[PDB]
Amino acid sequence: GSAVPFHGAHQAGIATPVQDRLHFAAFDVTTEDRAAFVALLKEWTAAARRLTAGHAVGEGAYGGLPEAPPDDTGEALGLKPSRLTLTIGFGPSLFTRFGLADLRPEALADLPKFPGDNLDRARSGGDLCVQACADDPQVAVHAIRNLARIGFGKVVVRWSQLGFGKTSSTTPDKQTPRNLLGFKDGTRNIAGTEKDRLDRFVWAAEKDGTPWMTGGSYLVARRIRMHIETWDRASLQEQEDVFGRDKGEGAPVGKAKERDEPFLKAMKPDAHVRLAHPDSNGGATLLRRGYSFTDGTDGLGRLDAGLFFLAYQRDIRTGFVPVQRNLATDALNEYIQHVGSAVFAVPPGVRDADDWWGSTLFG
Amino acid sequence: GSAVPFHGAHQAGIATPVQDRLHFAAFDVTTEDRAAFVALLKEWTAAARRLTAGHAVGEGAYGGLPEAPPDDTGEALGLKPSRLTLTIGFGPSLFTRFGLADLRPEALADLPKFPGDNLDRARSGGDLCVQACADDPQVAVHAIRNLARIGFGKVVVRWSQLGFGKTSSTTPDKQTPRNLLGFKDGTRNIAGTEKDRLDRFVWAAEKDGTPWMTGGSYLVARRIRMHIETWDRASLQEQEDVFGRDKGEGAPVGKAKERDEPFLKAMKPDAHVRLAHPDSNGGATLLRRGYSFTDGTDGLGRLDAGLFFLAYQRDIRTGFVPVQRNLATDALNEYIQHVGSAVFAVPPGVRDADDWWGSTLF
Ligand code: HEM
Numbered sequence: 001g002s003a004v005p006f007h008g009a010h011q012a013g014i015a016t017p018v019q020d021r022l023h024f025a026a027f028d029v030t031t032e033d034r035a036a037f038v039a040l041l042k043e044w045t046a047a048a049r050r051l052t053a054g055h056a057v058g059e060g061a062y063g064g065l066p067e068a069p070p071d072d073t074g075e076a077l078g079l080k081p082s083r084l085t086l087t088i089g090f091g092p093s094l095f096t097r098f099g100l101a102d103l104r105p106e107a108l109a110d111l112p113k114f115p116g117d118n119l120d121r122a123r124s125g126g127d128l129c130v131q132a133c134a135d136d137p138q139v140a141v142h143a144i145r146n147l148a149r150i151g152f153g154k155v156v157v158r159w160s161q162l163g164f165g166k167t168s169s170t171t172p173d174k175q176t177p178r179n180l181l182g183f184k185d186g187t188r189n190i191a192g193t194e195k196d197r198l199d200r201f202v203w204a205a206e207k208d209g210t211p212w213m214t215g216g217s218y219l220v221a222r223r224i225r226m227h228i229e230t231w232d233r234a235s236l237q238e239q240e241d242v243f244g245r246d247k248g249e250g251a252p253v254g255k256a257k258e259r260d261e262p263f264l265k266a267m268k269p270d271a272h273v274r275l276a277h278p279d280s281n282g283g284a285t286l287l288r289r290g291y292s293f294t295d296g297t298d299g300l301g302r303l304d305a306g307l308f309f310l311a312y313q314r315d316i317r318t319g320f321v322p323v324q325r326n327l328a329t330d331a332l333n334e335y336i337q338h339v340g341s342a343v344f345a346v347p348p349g350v351r352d353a354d355d356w357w358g359s360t361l362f363g
Numbered sequence: 364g365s366a367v368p369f370h371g372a373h374q375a376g377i378a379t380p381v382q383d384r385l386h387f388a389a390f391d392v393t394t395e396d397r398a399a400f401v402a403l404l405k406e407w408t409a410a411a412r413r414l415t416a417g418h419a420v421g422e423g424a425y426g427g428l429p430e431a432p433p434d435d436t437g438e439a440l441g442l443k444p445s446r447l448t449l450t451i452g453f454g455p456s457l458f459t460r461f462g463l464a465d466l467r468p469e470a471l472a473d474l475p476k477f478p479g480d481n482l483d484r485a486r487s488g489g490d491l492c493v494q495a496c497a498d499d500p501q502v503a504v505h506a507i508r509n510l511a512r513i514g515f516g517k518v519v520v521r522w523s524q525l526g527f528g529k530t531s532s533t534t535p536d537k538q539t540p541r542n543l544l545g546f547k548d549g550t551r552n553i554a555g556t557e558k559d560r561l562d563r564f565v566w567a568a569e570k571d572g573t574p575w576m577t578g579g580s581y582l583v584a585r586r587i588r589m590h591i592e593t594w595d596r597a598s599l600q601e602q603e604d605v606f607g608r609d610k611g612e613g614a615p616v617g618k619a620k621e622r623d624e625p626f627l628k629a630m631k632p633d634a635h636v637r638l639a640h641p642d643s644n645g646g647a648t649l650l651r652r653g654y655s656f657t658d659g660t661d662g663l664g665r666l667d668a669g670l671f672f673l674a675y676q677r678d679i680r681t682g683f684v685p686v687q688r689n690l691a692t693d694a695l696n697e698y699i700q701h702v703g704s705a706v707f708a709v710p711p712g713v714r715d716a717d718d719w720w721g722s723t724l725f
């Protein structure tokens with residue numbers, strides 16, 4: 001497939017097929033003027049319609065008046081749409097502007113402090129996010145660079161993260177990706193095909209309390225560093241006991257195949273799968289949509305690598321919070337550290353050509 | 364997803380078609396034992412033969428003794444070779460160790476200071492490098508991680524650079540990629556099929572004065588920050604005048620097609636193409652093989668963006684140095700800053716299964 005439709009009851013980039021690459025950006029708002037911000041949301045929506053179809057923004061990247069800057073910065077000319085999706089979300093800090101304080105959803109809860117948190121304030125929070133997913137990373141970067149340019153004077157970029165999953169040209173669609181610890185990652189997840197499970201666990205409903213959010217969802221982002229060089233010194237048995245699945249096949253202990261249902265009593269009590277499973281958490285179930293990262297090496301020569309964890313849910317209080325609380329004693333905690341965090345309310349979809357991002361909130 | 368052959372008279376990853384992704388690492392040596400360093404070069408060569416064919420290193424990623432760490436870290440299981448190449452180079456600082464002082468090639472020149480340089484010493488230099496290029500970033504990270512692990516106690520990573528997309532071409536028959544300024548980059552390079560031009564401008568020859576380097580090359584690496592706020596407010600005419608080519612087609616000024624030959628006298632006297640062209644530099648010609656990068660935000664509300672510039676040449680003194688000296692008046696200097704630098708001697712190819720990286724030096 002080459003393009004993903006932009007219009008719908010829901011924003012694309014949640015339940016639509018998982019693309020190979022991510023560019024995730026958090027923005028802070030610099031204007032106090034509600035009218036100026038609405039004008040920007042309409043201009044951004046018009047740009048997103050062009051970008052997700054493989055077209056340049058505005059009048060184009062070349063062929064305009066020579067004495068004017070081009071409307072599009074030009075680095076995606078000649079590339080394909082690449083399944084680009086652009087998903088916008090609103091942080092709790094936006095609701096302190098524009099008279100919105102009584103329209104913050106109760107489901108957009110502030111996260112508690114969790115044991116072992118080491119959060120960098122500069123790579124946490126944000127008034128707004130745009131999640132750009134595509135199979136070509138230059139298509140994703142071009143989208144973020146041009147939205148930031150259109151918004152200059154009204155928004156600034158607070159923090160940015162590049163990520164990667166599978167490379168689809170060489171890797172079959174059905175094959176579970178491996179994370180940078182070398183384990184299969186995504187076996188037991190909500191799939192975009194499971195319409196009733198998305199209604200139960202992912203999409204906000206009208207009766208949940210906040211009518212503007214009907215058909216939206218709630219996003220938790222966590223930048224999780226892995227202690228790669230410590231993990232690589234652990235024995236094979238220590239690594240498998242941390243998860244409760246074997247490394248080669250990814251089967252649950254005492255089973256033969258990856259997709260065999262787990263028997264939780266055969267795993268160690270503090271194994272990651274046993275603690276995270278819905279049966280250990282009162283039925284709490286998440287849509288995981290995260291990406292691996294490798295940013296470089298730190299000052300000590302260690303690899304700056306890990307998982308940029310993204311979870312979508314109907315209510316932060318009944319999805320991420322109870323599951324992450326249950327990981328207080330996870331055997332995996334020896335090898336990871338949460339170093340960035342943010343939460344966002346992801347509004348409903350853009351219904352047609354005349355609609356715009358945030359129209360249910362702003363009017 | 365196909366394999367690139369590892370053995371040859373030359374190392375792969377130079378004339379080879381340019382792959383989508385880069386992971387570049389520079390290492391410093393921490394052992395004084397020559398025999399221990401030779402043992403590492405042989406173990407690294409054996410690992411490279413496995414990794415470039417899509418196999419796990421050593422005894423594999425699982426199914427060994429439960430109480431031992433796996434020989435391979437496992438995150439490339441089930442992936443194709445993805446055109447992985449692994450290219451090793453030796454920095455000038457290596458030749459102060461192991462009694463190698465008299466074997467440093469004359470062509471491995473230290474670079475002069477250039478006007479506008481702001482070089483970070485921590486992300487410059489290095490005793491040696493490994494260039495990993497592949498179409499899958501996970502395959503490239505797995506290769507660098509496993510080499511670093513094998514080298515524990517003998518080498519440490521000094522600095523690394525990931526490139527998310529290529530800004531170079533050795534295949535003129537395929538689409539030329541764009542850099543983050545929005546211009547095609549790679550039109551007039553050296554192609555992998557141009558055997559005469561590779562022998563003249565890229566490969567070191569026995570007669571050049573350093574027999575152990577015959578069939579090798581010399582690498583310059585420059586980390587270049589781009590002033591994208593400043594560039595994005597420039598007019599279309601300003602952008603095109605900086606280069607001497609139009610933005611949409613990438614043709615030389617006045618001409619209709621990308622690959623039409625430049626007419627230099629129609630360009631501004633400070634245009635990048637006019638100053639960099641071989642005819643402006645006594646014939647000096649380079650093989651360019653760079654990649655784009657973005658390392659987050661700059662903490663001032665903007666995306667960080669740059670180009671990791673890589674050039675291969677027969678002699679640094681006759682390749683990169685004269686061309687970069689001629690760029691002192693380039694219109695492009697308003698929009699870039701060099702912030703990292705390193706040079707390396709890239710030895711000849713691994714001839715067969717009994718040969719090893721660096722065997723002609725050691
Ligand atoms: C670097 C951090 C992490 C790594 C490497 C990791 C790895 C894994 C692996 C290998 C599995 C098993 C295969 C699968 O079903 O996907 C798994 C399952 C799971 N993980 Fe994690 N995980 C991490 C962080 C988290 C966090 C922060 C949460 C939630 C707060 C979470 C929730 C889950 C859930 C819900 C499952 C599925 C359990 C089931 O229903 O069987 N993980 N994870």
Ligand code: HEM
Nearest residue numbers: 542546547548549550551587636639640641670686687699
């Ligand atoms: C961020 C930095 C740079 C950018 C954005 C850039 C961009 C370009 C562009 C757009 C072209 C024209 C198309 C092509 O033939 O490749 C070009 C050509 C060229 N560049 Fe650069 N360049 C940069 C740095 C450098 C450096 C540092 C050198 C060498 C010291 C260099 C050497 C060349 C050469 C030799 C040509 C081909 C000229 C010819 O024979 O026609 N460039 N560059």
